[PDB]
Amino acid sequence: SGFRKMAFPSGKVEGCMVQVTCGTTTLNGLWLDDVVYCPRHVICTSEDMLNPNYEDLLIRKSNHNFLVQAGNVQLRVIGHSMQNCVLKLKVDTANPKTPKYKFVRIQPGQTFSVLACYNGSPSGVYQCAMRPNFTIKGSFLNGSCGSVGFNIDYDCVSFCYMHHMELPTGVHAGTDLEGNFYGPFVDRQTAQAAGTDTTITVNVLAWLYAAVINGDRWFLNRFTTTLNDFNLVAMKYNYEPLTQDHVDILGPLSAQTGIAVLDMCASLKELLQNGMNGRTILGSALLEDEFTPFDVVRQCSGVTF
């Protein structure tokens, strides 16, 4: 019993975190094989950021300008190239702690663990979701750029996020490991704002199934709904549309609990129109949308890494 916001064990990623210094800027890098990946904004000054020609800025840099540090050992940079908004620093030494890994780009609603780092040293791990507006509601201070988001699939680390910036509302924006930003963000000092966010419907349904598995049934009702009627109600409450793919992915939880997805949808509909009425679900007075259906199954079945 119990349901917690649980992150993947961070050990495989800790052995990859390095410190990257270029000029006055120090941020984090991801050391995999003989390449250190980091945000390309490490090559920028406060003025450079206003209007940066990154090819022009990088052509002026030499390998010795990048100081890479893995623990108390300085790595030697033997090459540098840029791929989108990530800088790839070729180093002489392959990381002996390089795990089995993949670079994956996630979709909004998908969750991942963030290993927040400062000066190449991991300070904390937490669970996140890629919001429908492509921001993440992370916890980051100055120096956290280059901190990565990941999932574990068996013994394989799937790197899905690299931290680049904090938007004015305090939410976070970053790229996949190929340097492509999530969302309409740019690594330029310009007016940028997170779009109006929506609630990840399939994840709220997964979390309601997790509550039923844990013994919370007060919100259940005798009613069902059509997927079309549910989506009409979801549109009104700034909830993401629920697709047939979402209904299919919730199937195993529906079979285990005995509550069909459209039956759980009628529960969610009543919760949206009437609220919780002073009650809580899994110790929360709000509907939680940062547990995917796979996260609920993994936690309520105990998959290991």
Ligand X SMILES: O=C(Nc1cncc2ccccc12)C(F)(F)c1ccc(Cl)c(Cl)c1
Buried b (16+ CB within 10 A) or exposed e, 38-55: bbbbbbbeeebeeebebe
80 catalytically annotated: no
300 binds a second copy (CB under 8 A): yes
Cβ proximity to a second copy, 92 vs 153, nearer residue: 153
| C-alpha to C-alpha distance for 172 and 228, rounded to whole angstroms | 33
Given 125, 156, 260, 272, the residue binding a second copy (CB under 8 A): 125
Interface positions, 120-179, toward ligand X (CB under 6 A): 140-142, 144-145, 164-166
Q: 49 touches which of ligand X, a second copy, none (CB within 5 to 8 A by kind)?
A: ligand X
Q: How far is the CB of 20 from a second copy (least distance, A)?
A: 15
Q: How far is the CB of 51 from ligand X (least distance, A)?
A: 11
| C-alpha to C-alpha distance for 194 and 102, rounded to whole angstroms | 28
Under 8 Å between Cβ of 250 and 293:
yes
Reading the block at residue 44, the tokens are 């920028």
145 catalytically annotated: yes
Interface positions, 45-104, toward a second copy (CB under 8 A): none
- Binding footprint of ligand X, residue count (CB under 6 A): 14
DSSP track, 248-295:
HHTHHHHHHHT--HHHHHHHHHHHHHH--TT--BTTBSS---S--HHH
Interface positions, 189-248, toward a second copy (CB under 8 A): 214-215
Reading the block at residue 69, the tokens are 């540090």
Interface positions, 213-242, toward ligand X (CB under 6 A): none
298 binds ligand X (CB under 6 A): no
Phi then psi for 48, rounded to 5 degrees?
A: -55, -40
- H or E stretch including 162? strand 156-166
Residues that bind a second copy (CB under 8 A): 1-12, 14-15, 115-119, 121-128, 137-141, 143-144, 166, 170-172, 214-215, 280, 283-286, 298-305
Residues that bind ligand X (CB under 6 A): 1, 41, 49, 140-142, 144-145, 164-166, 187-189
